[PDB]
Coordinates of C-alpha atoms in Angstrom, one line a residue:
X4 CA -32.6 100.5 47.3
X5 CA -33.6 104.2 47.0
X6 CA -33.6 106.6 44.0
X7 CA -33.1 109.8 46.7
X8 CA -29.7 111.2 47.2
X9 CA -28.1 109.9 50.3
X10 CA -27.7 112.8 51.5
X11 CA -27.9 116.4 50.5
X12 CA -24.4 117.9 49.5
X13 CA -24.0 121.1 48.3
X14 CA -21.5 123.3 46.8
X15 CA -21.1 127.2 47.2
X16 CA -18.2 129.5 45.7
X17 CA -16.6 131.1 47.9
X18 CA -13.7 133.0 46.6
X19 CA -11.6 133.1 43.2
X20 CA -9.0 131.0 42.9
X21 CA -5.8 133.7 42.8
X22 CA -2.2 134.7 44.7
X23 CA -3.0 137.4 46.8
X24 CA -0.4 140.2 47.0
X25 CA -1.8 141.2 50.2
X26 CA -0.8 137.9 52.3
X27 CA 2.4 137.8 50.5
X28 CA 3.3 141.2 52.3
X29 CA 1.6 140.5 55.5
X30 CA 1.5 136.7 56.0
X31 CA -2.3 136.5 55.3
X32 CA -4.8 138.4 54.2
X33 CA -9.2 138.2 54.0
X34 CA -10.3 137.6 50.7
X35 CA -13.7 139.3 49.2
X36 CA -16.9 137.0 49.3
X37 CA -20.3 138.2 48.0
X38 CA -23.8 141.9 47.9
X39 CA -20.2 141.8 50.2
X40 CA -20.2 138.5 52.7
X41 CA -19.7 139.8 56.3
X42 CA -19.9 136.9 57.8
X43 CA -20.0 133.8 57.1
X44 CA -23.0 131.9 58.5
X45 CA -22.7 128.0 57.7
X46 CA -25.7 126.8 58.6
X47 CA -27.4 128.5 55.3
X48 CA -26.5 128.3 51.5
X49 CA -25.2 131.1 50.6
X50 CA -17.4 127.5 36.9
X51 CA -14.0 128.2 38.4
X52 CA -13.0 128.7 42.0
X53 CA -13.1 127.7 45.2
X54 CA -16.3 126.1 47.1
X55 CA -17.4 124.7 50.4
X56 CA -19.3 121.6 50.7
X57 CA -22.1 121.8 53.2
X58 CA -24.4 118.7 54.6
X59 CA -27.6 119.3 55.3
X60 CA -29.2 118.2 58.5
X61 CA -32.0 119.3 60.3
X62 CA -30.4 122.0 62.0
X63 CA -29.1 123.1 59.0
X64 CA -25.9 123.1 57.0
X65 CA -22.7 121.6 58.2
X66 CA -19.5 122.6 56.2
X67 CA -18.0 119.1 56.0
X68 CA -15.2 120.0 53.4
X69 CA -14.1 122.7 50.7
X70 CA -12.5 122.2 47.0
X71 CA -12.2 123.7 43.7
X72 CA -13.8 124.0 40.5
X73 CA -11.7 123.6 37.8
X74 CA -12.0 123.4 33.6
X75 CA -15.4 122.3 34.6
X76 CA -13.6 119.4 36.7
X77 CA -14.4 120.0 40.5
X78 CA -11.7 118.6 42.8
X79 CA -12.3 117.7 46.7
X80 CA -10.8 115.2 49.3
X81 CA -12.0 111.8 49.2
X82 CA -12.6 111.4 52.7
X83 CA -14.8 114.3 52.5
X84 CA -17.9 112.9 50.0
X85 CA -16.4 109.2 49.9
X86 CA -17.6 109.4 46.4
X87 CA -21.2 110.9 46.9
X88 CA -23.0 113.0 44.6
X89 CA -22.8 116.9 44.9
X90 CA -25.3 119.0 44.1
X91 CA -25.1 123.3 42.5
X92 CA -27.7 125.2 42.1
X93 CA -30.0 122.1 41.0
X94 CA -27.3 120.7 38.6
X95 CA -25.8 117.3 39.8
X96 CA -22.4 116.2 39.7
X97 CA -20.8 113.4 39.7
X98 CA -17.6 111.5 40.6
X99 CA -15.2 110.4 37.3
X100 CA -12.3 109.4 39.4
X101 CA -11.0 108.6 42.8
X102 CA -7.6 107.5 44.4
X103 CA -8.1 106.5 47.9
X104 CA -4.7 106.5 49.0
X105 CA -4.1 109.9 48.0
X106 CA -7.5 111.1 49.7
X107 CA -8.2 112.4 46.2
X108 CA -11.4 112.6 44.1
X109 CA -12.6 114.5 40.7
X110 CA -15.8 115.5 39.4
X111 CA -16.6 116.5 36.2
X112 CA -13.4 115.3 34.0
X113 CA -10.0 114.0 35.1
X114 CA -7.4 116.1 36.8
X115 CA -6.8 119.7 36.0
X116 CA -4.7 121.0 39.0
X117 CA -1.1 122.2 37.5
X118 CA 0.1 124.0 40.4
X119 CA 3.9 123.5 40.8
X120 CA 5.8 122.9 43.8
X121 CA 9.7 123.2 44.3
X122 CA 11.7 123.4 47.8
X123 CA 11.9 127.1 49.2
X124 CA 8.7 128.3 47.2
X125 CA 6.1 129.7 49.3
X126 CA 2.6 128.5 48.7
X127 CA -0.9 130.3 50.0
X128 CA -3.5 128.3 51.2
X129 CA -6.8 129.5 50.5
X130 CA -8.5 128.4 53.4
X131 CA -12.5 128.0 53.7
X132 CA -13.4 127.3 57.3
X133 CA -15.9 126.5 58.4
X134 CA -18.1 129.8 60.0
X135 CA -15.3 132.1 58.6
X136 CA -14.8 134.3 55.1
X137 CA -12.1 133.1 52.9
X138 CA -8.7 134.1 54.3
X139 CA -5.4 133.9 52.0
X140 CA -2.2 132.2 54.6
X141 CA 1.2 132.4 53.4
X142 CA 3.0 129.5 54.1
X143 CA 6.4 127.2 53.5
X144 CA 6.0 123.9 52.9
X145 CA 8.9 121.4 53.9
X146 CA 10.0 118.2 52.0
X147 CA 9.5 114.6 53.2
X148 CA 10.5 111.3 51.9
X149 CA 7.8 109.1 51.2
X150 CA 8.3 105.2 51.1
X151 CA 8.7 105.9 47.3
X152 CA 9.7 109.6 46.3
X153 CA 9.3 112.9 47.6
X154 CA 6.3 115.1 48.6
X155 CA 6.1 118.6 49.6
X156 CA 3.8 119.2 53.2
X157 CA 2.1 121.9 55.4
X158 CA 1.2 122.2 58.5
X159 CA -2.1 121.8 59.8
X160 CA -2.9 125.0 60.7
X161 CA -6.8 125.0 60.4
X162 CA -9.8 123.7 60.9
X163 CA -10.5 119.7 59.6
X164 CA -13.6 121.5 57.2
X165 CA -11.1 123.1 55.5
X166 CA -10.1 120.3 53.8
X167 CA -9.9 120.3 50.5
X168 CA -9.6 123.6 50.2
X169 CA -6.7 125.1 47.4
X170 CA -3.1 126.0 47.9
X171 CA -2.0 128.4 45.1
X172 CA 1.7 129.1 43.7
X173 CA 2.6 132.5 42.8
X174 CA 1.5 131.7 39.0
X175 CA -1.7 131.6 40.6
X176 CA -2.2 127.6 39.9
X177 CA -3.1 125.1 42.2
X178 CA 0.0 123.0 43.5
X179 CA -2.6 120.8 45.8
X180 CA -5.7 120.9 48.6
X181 CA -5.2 121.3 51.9
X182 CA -5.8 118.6 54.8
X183 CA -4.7 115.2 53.4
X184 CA -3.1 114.1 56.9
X185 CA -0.1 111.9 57.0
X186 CA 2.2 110.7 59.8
X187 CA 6.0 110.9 60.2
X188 CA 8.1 108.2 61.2
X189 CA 9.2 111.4 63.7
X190 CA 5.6 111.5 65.7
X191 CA 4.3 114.1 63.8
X192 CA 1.0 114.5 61.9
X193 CA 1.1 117.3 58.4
X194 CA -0.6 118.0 55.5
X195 CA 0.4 116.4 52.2
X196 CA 0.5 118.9 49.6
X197 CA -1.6 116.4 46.6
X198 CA 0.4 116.9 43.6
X199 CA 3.9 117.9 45.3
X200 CA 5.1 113.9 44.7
X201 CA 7.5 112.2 42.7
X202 CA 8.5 108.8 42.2

């Protein structure tokens, strides 16, 4: 085999992990990135918060995914990395557990998102997609019944690089990631909100 990454996956923060009072008021609001970020230009690089994962490739840097850095746990979507090593500013980081029917995955420690969920609560999702600054969305989630419990879902309402990227109570805690698709027995394909669950 080979002693070289499979590929090159790296993380850049992005924006703190907060409520913003702003989007609360007007349904959404841009978040400050920094000198202050502009623009967002994917195809270059550049503790707690919120990160995108970028690939690189010969043309550059492809944001394939987004997550959060956590009580030194970093949290993403297993579809995203399917378990691969990510790399910070030279310092490697590696998986300590996965759960692939929940399209989960934690680096760095165990689970440390403690975000709360009840019906009729309003949520922000901190979305990082890809080619754009961090924008705060305001946003209801409904409730569905799982083949086992409840869990609380979104819409998907951004792009499919956004995924794993945080949705925030109004204590500011992180109640789940965006863009772990599911299908309805009605037709329909939503976002399940990762901790939102019961059983």
């Amino acid at each position: 085999g080979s002693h070289m990454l499979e590929a090159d996956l790296e993380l850049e923060r992005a924006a703190d992990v907060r409520w913003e009072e702003q989007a609360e008021i007007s349904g959404s609001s841009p978040i400050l990135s920094i000198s202050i970020k502009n623009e967002e230009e994917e195809q270059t690089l550049g503790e707690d918060g919120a990160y995108r994962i970028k690939q690189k490739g010969i043309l550059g840097y492809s944001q394939i995914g987004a997550g959060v850095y956590k009580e030194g746990t970093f949290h993403t979507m297993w579809h995203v990395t399917r378990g691969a090593v990510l790399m910070h500013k030279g310092k490697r980081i590696e998986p300590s557990w996965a759960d692939v029917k929940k399209d989960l995955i934690s680096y760095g420690g165990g689970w440390k998102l403690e975000g709360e969920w009840k019906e009729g609560e309003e949520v922000q999702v901190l979305a990082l997609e890809p080619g754009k600054n961090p924008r705060a969305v305001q946003t209801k989630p409904g409730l569905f019944k799982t083949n086992t419990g409840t869990i609380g879902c979104v819409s998907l309402d951004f792009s499919p690089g956004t995924s794993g990227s945080p949705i925030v109570d109004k204590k500011g805690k992180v109640v789940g990631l965006y863009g772990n698709g599911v299908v309805t027995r009605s037709g329909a394909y939503v976002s399940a909100i990762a901790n939102t669950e019961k059983s």
